[PDB]
Amino acid sequence: RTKLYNAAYFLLNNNESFGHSFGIRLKIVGLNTWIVGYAVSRYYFSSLRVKAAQDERF
Amino acid sequence: MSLVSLFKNTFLKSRVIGLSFQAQRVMAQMAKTDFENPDEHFLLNDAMKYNELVFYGRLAENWSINPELFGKAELAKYNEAKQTLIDFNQYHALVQNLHEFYWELKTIYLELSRGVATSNFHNKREVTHSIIESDIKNSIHKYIQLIDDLKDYPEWQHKVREEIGYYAHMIYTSVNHDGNFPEIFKEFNKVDSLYYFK
Amino acid sequence: PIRNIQFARYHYLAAVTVFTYFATRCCLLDYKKYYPLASVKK
Amino acid sequence: MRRIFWNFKTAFVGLPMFSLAPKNILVYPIVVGVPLYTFIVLQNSVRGFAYFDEYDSDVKE
Amino acid sequence: MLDDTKYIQMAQKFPRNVSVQLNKKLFVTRTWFRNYYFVGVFGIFAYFIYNQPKIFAPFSGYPTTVAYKAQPDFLNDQVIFYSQQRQNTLKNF
Amino acid sequence: SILPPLQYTYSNEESLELLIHSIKGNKDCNSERKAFNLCRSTVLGKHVEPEKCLDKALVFVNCFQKVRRDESAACQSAFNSTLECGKKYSSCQSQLDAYLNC
Amino acid sequence: ARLWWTLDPSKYYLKQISSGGRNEILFTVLGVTAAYWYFGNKRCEHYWRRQIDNCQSWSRAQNINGNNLTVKQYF
Amino acid sequence: NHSCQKVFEGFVSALYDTSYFFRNFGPFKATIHYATYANYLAQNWAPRVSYIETSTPAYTLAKNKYAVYIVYGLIGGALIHNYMLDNKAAQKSQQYYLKHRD
Amino acid sequence: VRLNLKSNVDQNEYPFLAKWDKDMRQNYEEYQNRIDATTYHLQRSQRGIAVFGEWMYPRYFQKDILELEVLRRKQQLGKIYPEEVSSYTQINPDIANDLNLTFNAKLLWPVRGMTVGAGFFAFAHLFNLPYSFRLGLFVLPTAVELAFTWGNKTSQFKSIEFMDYLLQYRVSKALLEKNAKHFAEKKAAYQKEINSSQSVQDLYNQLITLVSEQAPS
Amino acid sequence: MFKELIHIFRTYFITFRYLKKSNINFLKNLSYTLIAYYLIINFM
């Protein structure tokens, strides 16, 4: 009992203007994500517990 | 001696007068802005004595002043400023109620659209649940009653029909007219349907 | 007429740079990855 | 149920998107990340990357 | 300027006794949806900002430490440990 | 308030002389230093049995004392020149190397 | 749009008071005065520290129960 | 849903009532209003160094044309005085300890 | 540096010392490698220029100094026995938790976070909500638990203190074993003639203070 | 960058539209306060 529509993109053909706009937006998002991911990886890799012995347990 | 009282009276009077002078434009902008997030364009474009004016109105309606130092005209102006602050606070409360109704309508519309999005692979239900239909019916009845209550103000009624009714039209277009759909859309599909060309 | 527009732009850019430096530690890296791939002195 | 419809290999969402995402997303991290990383790494090695083998590390029983 | 006659008329003349009953379920759903968007992203950012200074600088959160020196008690087969309170400092750089 | 506090206070001249003597010792008595480090590397010689490494420690200490002595006239002159250059510093690599070759 | 990164200050945040410019001279004076008290204590503490061991700085430790802290040989 | 939809609706009503009570309770409401006003004052009237110079220069106060320069000079003087005080304190501590090392 | 794996301990007269030596020789190589990596990183940072080094060092190199100190402490003490940790609980409880969150001795899953997430799933199946929302809620408590667990740097200081206490206790215990045969003769007579469980070190402090207090002088 | 990120969230994430602009303005203020606090703490 609901109205179903099309994706308007899975049926549309790729366009040069759409491709350019998507490339620009993706480049900006990729820059931001690269910076954020570098910071996150620096945080995660440095927040690891030290190496243990062969069979040390607490 | 009465330095504290003098300073309090002077500051309160100055703030009340400043907020009352700059209140008509603020109220007009509040009417201009849509109901959803009615404080829009203030925190973004220009907060021209909106938050300061609300705080000052609340203080004035919740505090007292000493008219002994103020003259007759000063006391009249302070009382007028307090009355203007009270009227602005009432308008703000009415706008908050309208914003709450519009936000409920928008939440209902977003719930309807959420199960129809192409990215909604978590749950895709063709027929709406009875809870959603009953909530929509109650909201339609409330919208009809509120619009009827706005008969005394044609401009306010038109603004309400334009703002709140847009979400109603969006929800109606998102639901097929089968089964109990006419039972749900009996209230809306009398005059307000044709306003959105439906 | 924004007073000290150059000062405002410089402050914003410097704030962005300082936030990036402090939050990511880009200037203070760890060379322990290349430590095994190094020639020891002495 | 969800009878999806999509002209595969001819759409904005598909093989063109897969081919276009890597070349454009990896722009700043590839035009600015590598040079900055190389400069920062080589800044420490003003004389060389050799590590002073402190704590002996050359003495064996 | 502008012609704000309609807005001015609406602002000047407003119904002071107009209200609508609130949908508690819808209001609570909206509040929970706002919180969930607030909770995840906002707390993640707040922890990342707050825990970065505390993790990149452990000497700041630990002002004092204890140092123990043990001596034997062979007859009673015990260890007597003397203690001293020192300041947590960057030892050996 | 994060840097370690100083325990034994030495003047600037004393520190420069000690640094020069330590460079000379590391360039001369490196074998003694390695022997001392190896003898003081195991748990026993480190904490349990300190009397074992006593001979190697004494050898290293005697070597350090002889190095810091700079009894030779050339060594003394080179040390004085290097100390003068270091005090002028409040560069000098050539003077340090000349002192080392002595 | 497609390019929104600008170095100009925010038009909403570039406001000015009715008594003149933004309250900055007083704020800067308060910040500087607070810094003197703040970055006068760390300077005093860092530069006036001495490390001394005299065989009396050690004190017999006690457990959280207050009794003398002693560990059995075989635990 | 089911008979548990009554439980869901009751929980929603209880949450709404709790939110309304916490919001509309006189003391906490006055405190929240004051806090909102203070936050508006802090954020909207932040001590930015750049601001709108809308008035003509003949009416512009010299305090605004010198505010940036005054703030920069104060910051630079504070930094220089802090560095000089740190250096002087280090030297004085070294001298006092050398005197007391005797 | 390259200590041989074979220890020359008797292993028939001082078993505790022999085991300590074996543990120290076992973990010496990996600890030395990690310490060398940390030292090389520190040297490279010191070789840095301006904001990239030699200006914020070692002030900004705080996580590396503590890591190096912890690595050195772990190199000094071969293996930490679980029995000795509980003794350190007499001074500081949760020492085992701090060591586990610091020494990576085992796997640390968000147990309480998993329980909280499953708790939200119970409400998710009572007040019918999307399974994606239920999974998000289950991850959120688990994510909070993981965030609150990892990054505990003060726990590293607590573990350093525990390791120092354990090293001191082991050093004292090893000394007891060496002189056990020599002190065996005195121990029996001392126990026979002195009914006292407290250490003689504090007992001597009592006698000295009593003599300084009430004596004919 | 904050306004652009908010627009991106409101464009792609439909669930991000459930939060009103008043919360977003509180979110932006909270983000600014956190950024200032982090900048101070890194230097303090």
Chain D adjacent subunits, 3+ CB pairs under 8 A: A, C, F, I
- Are the C-beta atoms of residues I53 and F74 closer than 8 Å to each other? no
Q: C13 and chain J: CB distance < 8 Å anywhere?
A: no
J37 and chain H in contact, CB less than 8 A = no
| DSSP-assigned states of every residue in E7-41 | HHHHHHS--TT------HHHHHHHHHHHHHHIIII
Q: Is the peptide bond before I58 cis (omega within 30 degrees of 0)?
A: yes
F17 CB contacts (<8 Å, ≥6 apart)? F68, F79, F83
Q: Do E4 and B32 touch (CB under 8 A)?
A: yes
Say yes or no: C9 contacts chain E, CB-CB below 8 A: no
Neighbours of B197 (CB within 10 A): 6
- Cβ G9–C9 below 8 Å, yes or no? yes
Tell me if residue H84 falls in helix, strand or coil.
helix
Beta bridge partners, G60, equal E82
Which DSSP symbol is given to D14?
A: S
Of all residues in chain F, the one with the smallest CA distance to E93 is F3
Q: What are phi and psi of E65, to 5 degrees?
A: -140, 170
Chains I and F touch (3+ CB pairs under 8 A): yes
Cα B22 to Cα B74, B76, E8, J15, distances in angstroms = 18, 18, 13, 37
How far is the first Cα of chain J from the last one, in angstroms, to the nearest whole number? 26
| Residue given tokens 């070294």 in the structure block | H94
CB H75 within 8 Å of CB G28 = yes
**CB distance E90–I200 less than 8 Å?**
no
Contact A42, A48 (CB under 8 A): no
Q: Is residue A21 marked as binding?
A: yes
Q: How far apart are CA I213 and CA I210, in angstroms?
A: 5
Alpha helix ranges (H) inside chain I: 15-26, 28-46, 62-76, 82-88, 95-103, 111-126, 131-149, 154-178, 180-193, 200-213
* Contact (CB<8Å) C30/A46: yes
List Cβ neighbours of I205 (8 Å cut-off, separation of 6 or more): none
Token reading at H20: 């309304």
Is there a contact between F2 and E91 if contact means CB atoms under 8 Å apart? no
CA atoms within 13 A on the CB side of I208: 6
Distance (Å, whole) CA E21 – CA I128: 25
Residue pair I162/I95 in contact by the 8 Å Cβ criterion: yes
**Percentage helix, strand, coil for chain E under 3-state DSSP, each rounded to 5:** 50, 20, 30
Q: Are A2 and B178 in contact (CB under 8 A)?
A: no
The CA-based angle H50-H54-H55, given to 5 degrees, is 120
The helix or strand, by DSSP H or E, that contains position E84, with its residue range, turns out to be: strand E78-87
Q: For E81, which of G57, G69, G73 is closest by C-beta distance?
A: G69
DSSP string, C3-33: TTHHHHHHHHHHHHHHHHHHHH-SSS---TT
CA E18, E23, E29 angle in degrees (round to 5)?
135
CA gap F22, F82 in Å, rounded: 13
Interchain contact C24–A (C-beta under 8 A): yes
For an interface test with F, which of I4, I19, I21 has the most F Cβ atoms less than 10 Å from its Cβ? I21
Pick from F45, G48, E6, B84: nearest CA to H92: G48
- Does the beta-carbon distance from H78 to G25 stay under 8 Å? no
Out of H8, H9, H16, whose CB is closest to E27? H16
- Inform me whether the C-beta atom of residue H23 falls under 8 Å from chain E C-beta atoms: no
Residues of chain E positioned with their CB less than 8 A from the CB of H13 = 24
8 Å CB contact of B36 and J20 = yes
Q: Which of B146, B64, G17, I165 is nearest to E19 (CA)?
A: B146
How far is F3 from chain H, CA to nearest CA, in Å?
14
- Give the gap in angstroms from C-alpha I133 to the nearest C-alpha of chain B: 9
Residues of I in contact with A58 (CB under 8 A): 80, 82, 85, 96-97, 99-100, 103, 105-106
Evaluate whether G41 touches E47 at the Cβ level (below 8 Å). no
Record: contact G61-I91, CB cut-off 8 A: yes
Q: Quote the CA–CA distance of B85 and B91 in Å, as a whole number.
A: 10
- For tokens 């602005």, the residue is B88
Characterise I54 by phi-psi region: left (phi > 0), alpha (psi -120 to 50), beta (else): left
C-chain residues near G7 (CB < 8 A):
8-9, 12-13
Q: Which residues pair with G71 in a beta bridge?
A: E79
Helix (H) or strand (E) holding B6: helix B3-21
Nearest to B84, CA basis, from B107, B102, B61, B64: B61
Please give the residue of chain C at the shortest CA–CA distance from A41: C24
Contacts of A14 in chain D (CB under 8 A): 10-12, 14, 16-17
3 state DSSP class of J44: coil
User: Would you say A52 and I105 are in contact if contact means Cβ atoms under 8 Å apart?
Assistant: yes
Write down which chains contact chain C via at least 3 CB pairs under 8 A: A, D, E, G, H, I, J
User: E22 to chain H, minimum CA–CA distance in Å?
Assistant: 10
Query: For B19, what's the count of Cα atoms within 13 Å in the CB-facing half-sphere?
Result: 29
Q: Which residues of chain B are within 8 Å of residue I130 when distances are taken between CB atoms?
A: 122-123
What phi and psi values does residue D52 have, to the nearest 5 degrees? -65, 110
Chain H residues whose CB is inside 8 A of the E27 CB are: 16
Please, do chains F and A touch (3+ CB pairs < 8 Å)? Answer: no
No. of helices (H) and no. of strands (E), chain F? 6, 0
Q: Cα(first)–Cα(last) distance of chain H, in Å?
A: 88
C-alpha–C-alpha distance, residues A24 and D21, integer Å:
10
Could J3 and G5 be called an inter-chain contact, meaning their C-beta atoms sit closer than 8 Å?
no
- Kindly list the distances between the CA atom of residue I142 and the CA atoms of I98, I100, I108, I114, I125, in Å, as whole numbers in the listed order: 19, 18, 12, 5, 19
CA distance G6 to chain J (A): 10
Partners of residue E59 on adjacent β-strands:
none
* DSSP secondary structure string for all residues of D41-58: HHHH-SS-S-B---S-SS
Torsion angles phi and psi, residue H60, rounded to 5: -70, 130
- List of chain I residues whose C-beta atoms are within 8 Å of the C-beta of residue E43: 144
With an 8 Å Cβ cutoff, is A9 touching chain E?
no
Residue C23, chain E, CB below 8 Å: the answer is yes
H or E stretch covering B168: helix B154-173
Structure-block tokens of residue F14:
């004393």
Judge: I37–C35 Cβ closer than 8 Å, yes or no: yes
D49 Cβ neighbours under 8 A, 6+ residues apart: C34, C38, C39
Collect all residues with Cβ–Cβ distance below 8 Å to I30 and sequence separation of at least 6.
A51
Q: Are H60 and G24 in contact (CB under 8 A)?
A: no
Give which of A51, A8, J35, B162 is closest to I74, Cα–Cα. A51
Residues of J within 8 A of G4 (CB-CB) are 3-4
Interface test with G, best of E66, E74, E78, E91 (most G CBs within 10 A): E78
Q: Which residues of I31-55 are buried (b: 16+ CB within 10 A; e: fewer)?
A: bbebbbbbbbbbbbbebbeeebbee
CA dist J23 and E42 (Å) reads 12
To the nearest whole Å, the CA of C29 is away from the closest chain A CA by 9
How many Å apart are CA G74 and CA I15, to the nearest integer? Answer: 12
Residue C5 in contact with partner chain E when CB distance is under 8 A: no
Inter-chain touch G14–C9, beta carbons under 8 Å: no
DSSP state, B129?
A: P
Distance CA I150, CA E53 (A): 14
Q: Compute the residue count for chain A.
A: 58
What backbone phi and psi angles, to 5 degrees, belong to C29? -95, 170
Which chains reach chain B with 3 or more Cβ–Cβ distances below 8 angstroms?
Answer: A, E, G, H, I, J
Q: What is the DSSP string of B20-76?
A: HHTSHHHHHHHHHS-SSSTTTTTTTT--SSSHHHHHHHHHHHH----TTTS-HHHHH
Half-sphere exposure of I85 (CA within 13 A, CB side): 18
I1 vs D45, D52, D56: nearest CB: D56
Residue type for position I6: K
Q: Do B52 and H37 touch (CB under 8 A)?
A: yes
F1, F3, F8, F9: which to substitute to probe chain G, counting the most G Cβ within 10 Å? F1
Residues B115 and A4: their CA atoms lie apart, in Å, by 10
